[PDB]
Amino acid sequence: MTILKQMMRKLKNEKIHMTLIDPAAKSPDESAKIAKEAEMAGTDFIMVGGSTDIDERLMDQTVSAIKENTNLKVILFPGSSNMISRHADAIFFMSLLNSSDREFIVGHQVKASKFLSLLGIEKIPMAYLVFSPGMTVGRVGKANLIDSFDRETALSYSLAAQYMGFKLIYFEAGSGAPRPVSEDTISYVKSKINIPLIVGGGIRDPETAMRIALAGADMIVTGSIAEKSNNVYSVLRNIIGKIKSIEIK
Amino acid sequence: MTILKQMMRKLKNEKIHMTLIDPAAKSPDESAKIAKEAEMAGTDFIMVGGSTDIDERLMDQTVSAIKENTNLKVILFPGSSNMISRHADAIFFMSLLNSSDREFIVGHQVKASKFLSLLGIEKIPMAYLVFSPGMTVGRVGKANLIDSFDRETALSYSLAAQYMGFKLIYFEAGSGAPRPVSEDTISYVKSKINIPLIVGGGIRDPETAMRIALAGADMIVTGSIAEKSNNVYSVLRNIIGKIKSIEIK
């Protein structure tokens, strides 16, 4: 019935991959081409969002082009911003739990909730935990960065998120991070929580995606990675095929 | 199976009443006497907690005495504190969303989560929204007090709580408040959310409990109200009988 239910059902059989498209990075038509190549590569959902703040008209154009060019559901990834498009299928309702500023824990969320209640868009509660180095979202979101290897702090935040009712936990290294969050942190936390763990940031090749998925990530988020659109398919296939080869206990 | 599931099943038939016992106010044995009288009066659950910080030994003694003297489940009501007793059946995992200080939104919660994960206690996610006047918890929790009549701010916080995954919303006027949160605010918010609404603070007589339940509160929280234990039963019966007389659509 819902994207969240689709995710939970899919996790019984395979790891999930999602492709994040930054609407500020390319034109709506180029974004749609990228989305179609990612669909063919086997990605499960398109995420749309970034750190660069843009107007709702551009958000609308990007989401509309993607939905016209693919059969995938589109999930908004607001991060530290209050970006919305009413054309998206779902939105990760994200709380940056390790921010020093209440504005990114509950501020933007409270300001956006009424408008969101007027829309048919699906609201998926997600705990957004920003790890070292954090990159732009770490800076803009005022994160008290969780060190990638500080698995006990990761666990405290993840358990708190679970006990607050969040349905997904997102380990965020930051867009462009040289390396993703530690495998040891991922495995340690995954062994102790009962909601899905998503890892994004610093995953740009099949071997990295494989080691992160094997460490315990339930879903992997990457960009389109390839500079040229005509190379996105081959690049994403190699990644997706690998993580979807893992047998799920 | 769980206290939360018991609550949801009960709400299909009747309004809920819970009796809050402050372990700092009376001796453990007196608390247990109060709990037994409240059980006979028809209360659904015993809540244990307050604003006065106490040692875990006193918490343990109070919860143990109550559980030895009644057949009711005991739910911890930490408020702005990190009070715990391992003898309780459940804990409201409370986030004071309208606090100005992140410490009461996520701070204490992150510090307590690991210990809580070591316990069999049931964790029930609750959004804790403190309204004017707020009393002691409003002061200590550093609340940006929601005016009792500011129904749109109430709605924004309640919808944000729902979209973050909280399972219960608690409208808190503060212990000892002269009047509870406005009926108009309660009805306005209740018409727009899909999780239960709990109202506490300022409810000390049957007519107040009746008007708050009719306005749209799903559960009512009161203290034992009566100065003398031998009068608790009659005082709580009159309240509980009234709110449990409301037909649920």
Contacts of B165 in chain A (CB under 8 A): 125, 164-167
Burial A8-30 (b: 16+ CB within 10 A, else e): eebeeebbbbbbbbbbeebebee
Cα distance between residue B239 and residue A36, in whole Å:
62
Both structure tokens of A220: 């992997």
* Residue in chain B nearest A157 by alpha carbon: B110
Vertex A155: Cα angle to A219 and A168 (nearest 5): 35
User: By C-alpha distance, which of B53, B54, B108, B44 is closest to B74?
Assistant: B44
Structure tokens, B209? 């409990």
A161 contacts A128 by C-beta, under 8 angstroms: no
Residues 6+ apart with CB under 8 A from A30: A229
Residue pair A221/A189 in contact by the 8 Å Cβ criterion: no
Q: With CB atoms and an 8 Å threshold, state whether B123 touches A97.
A: no
Domain span holding position B97: 1-249
Taking the CA of residue A159 and the nearest CA in chain B, the distance in Å comes to 6
Orientation of helix A183-190 relative to helix A151-164, angle to 10° = 40
**Phi, psi (rounded to 5 degrees) for B3:** -60, -40
Chain B positions contacting chain A at CB under 8 Å are: 93, 95, 97-102, 105-106, 109-114, 116-117, 123, 125, 152, 155-157, 159-160, 162-167, 192
Coil/strand/helix, residue A66: helix
CA dihedral of B18, B22, B23, B29, whole degrees rounded to 10? -60
Q: How far is CA B156 from CA A114, A137, B185, B189, B192, in A?
A: 6, 25, 12, 9, 10
Whether residue B38 contacts residue B224, with contact meaning beta carbons closer than 8 Å, is answered with yes
Tell me whether residue A247 is exposed, middle or buried, using C-beta atoms within 10 angstroms of its C-beta: 0 to 12, 13 to 18, 19 or more: exposed
C-alpha A134/C-alpha A41 separation (Å) is 28
AA identity, residue B14:
E
The one-character DSSP state at B87 is T
Phi then psi for residue A14, to 5 deg, are -160, 160
CB proximity list for B116: less than 8 A, separation 6 or greater: A159, A163, B84, B91, B93, B123
* Chain B: closest CA distance from residue A81 (Å): 15
Count of structural domains, chain A? 1
| Sequence letter at residue A238 | N
Alpha-carbon span A150 to A217, nearest angstrom = 17
CA dihedral (A57, A59, A64, A70) in degrees, to 10, reads 160
PDB resolution in Å: 1.7
**CATH number of the domain to which A193 belongs:** 3.20.20.390
Q: Where are the alpha helices (DSSP H) in chain A?
A: 3-11, 28-41, 56-69, 102, 108-117, 135-140, 151-164, 183-190, 206-215, 232-243
Surface-to-core class of residue A249, CB atoms within 10 Å of its CB (0-12 exposed, 13-18 middle, 19+ buried):
exposed
Query: How many residues are present in chain A?
Result: 249
Tell me how the structure was determined: X-ray
**Chain A nearest C-alpha distance from B113 (Å):** 5
- 3-class SS of residue B113: helix
- What is the number of other CB atoms lying within 10 angstroms of the CB of residue B39? 20
